[PDB]
Design a protein around this ligand. Structure first.
Ligand code: WO5
Length: 493
């Protein structure tokens, strides 16, 4: 196979969540990473993209992200489908959406549009604001806007950040459309989306139909859903299926696995799954005895959240090296368990076999929204303890870890903080293996029980562009904070 990593992941997903294939996860061929002729790596919609400069003067990343949002929407002929985490898009994010919608309306197109947010008056106000800003272009648009909560007790609601146009183009990643955190600030959050086209955009459209089908079903229950539409328009549970081809056109040669999760409160189990996991044991992840742990001790939860298993399978597929860039690997407990045991066990299995692991997280000084640990020791201790189970003791665990781990906090320039004195915040949900296959999406590696979505792309060419444009500049500046770095013999943990 040309695609050993996807092959492995796909075999896992089909055992975990067979009934969700097509809708919540899906393998496709024939896609394209959607970069420009001039800078073919600029499918990689990183922000801010001001490497080396503690003042972030030239934000080539941000500029390209907003331009690409506008360009994709402006090319719509039928549908625009947006999900994010509340608040609703504002600032220049909202401006980009408005500009795109006006452009499409001026090219003669009549559009259906869905905008869905997860959250803990807002929707109708956002609809009205958008409608006002569109002017005459609003006459062309059938709009649905909604906020939703699927479980109050599991803190479950939409967390995906997706923009799909005509079922053909898709932008997704970790970026919320929040002007204060990303744009109008001298300490912008560092994050990444990707832009693709092809059948894998269809996959995202079918994922969004899954969420909207639940949302429209629950639209009269105020505790669950707040819905607003333009004119006399109804809720559109299946806009994608109804408006776009099931057979999405091919655009390139890139193979992709789309994968998401349904969180808690949409669907409790995949009734088709016969998955029978070995559930790891004995860790110190559950800080309190009362907590129900969906991440580590709920088989049914896995079957409706294939993304957790997909990310653990991506790690397990690595033959040489794994790079992980996250806000955090660990969650705040309560209400969540501190870590995903199976993920740390998969990383430990890899280091024990000499596969190199790099983890870069957000500076704990953020705490200090954008960090959930006090110290990198909270990561290294856990990896060491899980390594001890398979290397025969704590000493052999520490040696394996020091010979195979790079663990650090993020910086984007030579300075320990931004020039304005605020720590760098990082929010990527990024995993790359073997300079071959990578995940970009909204699903954090720390325990979380939300509706999420992302893509796993197997393309050494694209993975090399990801190295040059993101992971290499990240390590260049971030390596100075490392507590463990096998490449320089640092072992302070
Ligand atoms: O949008 W998210 O965990 O990646 O709530 O900060």
């Amino acid at each position: 196979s040309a695609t050993p990593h996807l092959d492995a992941v796909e075999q896992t997903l089909r055992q975990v969540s067979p009934g969700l294939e097509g809708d919540v996860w899906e393998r496709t061929s024939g896609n394209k990473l959607d970069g420009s002729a001039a800078d073919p790596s600029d499918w990689l919609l990183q922000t801010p993209g001001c490497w080396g400069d503690d003042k972030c003067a030239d934000r080539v990343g941000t500029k390209r992200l907003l331009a690409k949002m506008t360009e994709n929407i402006g090319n719509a002929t039928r549908t625009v489908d947006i999900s994010t985490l509340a608040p609703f898009p504002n600032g220049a994010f909202q401006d980009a959406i408005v500009a795109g919608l006006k452009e499409s309306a001026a090219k003669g197109n009549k559009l259906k549009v869905r905008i869905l947010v997860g959250a803990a008056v807002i929707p109708s106000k956002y609809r009205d604001e958008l409608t006002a800003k569109l002017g005459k272009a609003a006459e062309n648009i059938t709009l649905n806007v909604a906020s939703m909560t699927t479980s109050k007790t599991a803190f479950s609601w939409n967390h995906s950040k997706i923009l799909v146009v005509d079922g053909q183009s898709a932008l997704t990643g970790g970026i919320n459309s929040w002007k204060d955190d990303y744009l109008d600030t001298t300490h912008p959050v560092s994050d990444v989306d990707l832009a693709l086209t092809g059948p894998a955009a269809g996959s995202a459209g079918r994922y969004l139909d899954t969420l909207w089908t639940w949302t429209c079903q629950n639209k009269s229950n105020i505790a669950s859903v707040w819905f607003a539409a333009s004119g006399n328009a109804g809720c559109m549970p299946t806009m994608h299926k109804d408006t776009n081809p099931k057979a999405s056109p091919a655009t390139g040669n890139v193979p992709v696995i789309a994968v998401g999760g349904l969180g808690v409160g949409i669907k409790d189990v995949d009734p088709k799954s016969t998955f029978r996991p070995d559930l790891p044991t004995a860790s110190d992840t559950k800080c309190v005895v009362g907590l129900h742990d969906n991440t580590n001790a709920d088989r049914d939860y896995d079957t409706v959240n294939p993304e957790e298993s997909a990310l653990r399978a991506l790690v397990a597929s690595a033959k040489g090296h794994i790079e992980i860039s996250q806000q955090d690997l660990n969650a705040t407990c309560p209400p969540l368990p501190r870590y995903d045991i199976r993920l740390y066990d998969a990383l430990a299995a890899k280091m024990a076999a000499g596969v190199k692991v790099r983890i870069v997280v957000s500076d704990p000084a953020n705490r200090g929204g954008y960090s959930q640990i006090k110290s990198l020791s909270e990561i290294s201790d856990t990896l060491r303890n899980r390594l001890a189970n398979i290397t025969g003791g704590q000493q052999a665990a520490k040696t394996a870890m020091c010979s195979n781990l790079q663990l650090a906090t993020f910086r984007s320039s030579p300075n320990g903080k931004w020039a304005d004195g605020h720590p760098y915040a990082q929010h990527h949900k990024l995993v790359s293996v073997d300079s071959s296959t990578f995940y970009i999406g909204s699903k954090n590696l720390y325990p979380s029980w939300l509706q999420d979505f992302g893509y796993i792309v197997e393309s050494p060419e694209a993975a090399k562009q990801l190295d040059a444009k993101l992971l290499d500049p990240q390590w260049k500046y971030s390596q100075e904070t490392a507590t463990v770095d096998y490449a320089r013999g640092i072992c302070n943990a």
